[PDB]
Structures are given as C-alpha cells and as structure tokens.
C-alpha cells in the first residue's frame, strides 16, 4: 500500500512538471507570433510612406 501511494505521488509530480513544460512551449509559439506581428507591421509602414 505504501508503495502504491508513493507511486501515485511521483506520478503527480512528473505529470505536473510536463504540464508546465507544454505550457512553456505554447508561450514560445505566442512569443514568436507576436514577434512576427511587429515585423509585419514595420514592413507595412514602408508601404504606407
């Protein structure tokens, strides 16, 4: 029973850890999308002037 309880606690630790990692990966895509927005709008400024 103690072995089962320890296994469940370890599983929660690893599961939550990987959830934070996938959360960071989504943040990286959001950052890259925002970087493209600024670069795209700076190219539009050249067209406007």
């Amino acid at each position: 029973s103690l072995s089962a309880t320890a296994s469940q606690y370890s599983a929660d630790k690893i599961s939550r850890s990987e959830a934070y990692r996938r959360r960071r990966q989504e943040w990286e895509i959001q950052r890259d999308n925002a970087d493209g927005e600024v670069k795209q709008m700076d190219a539009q400024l050249e067209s406007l002037k």
Partner: protein
C-alpha cells in the same frame, strides 16, 4: 523494407547511434527509481545529489 533492413545491419557496426542513456535492456529497478526522482524540469545540483 530498405529502411528497417539498414537499421538492423548498422546496429552491429555503429551501436552508439542507438544507445540511450536513459533506457537499456536490463536496467535495474533502482535505476528506474533514480530516473523517476530526476524527471522534473528544474534539477538543482543538490536535487541530483
């Protein structure tokens, strides 16, 4: 298949291309326990110790 035939033939000559330092046939239970204990994303020097 040419892909799978080449994979098994190269294993004898270049096994280092397939060695994984985290999994190996024959890994001890105590080694599996060690991998679980350092499966988080924030590994301090003291945590690994």
């Amino acid at each position: 298949r040419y892909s799978t035939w080449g994979g098994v033939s190269r294993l004898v000559y270049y096994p280092e291309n397939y060695i994984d330092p985290t999994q190996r046939i024959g890994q001890t239970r105590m080694m599996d326990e060690l991998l679980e204990n350092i499966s988080q994303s924030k590994l301090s020097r003291d945590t690994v110790e």
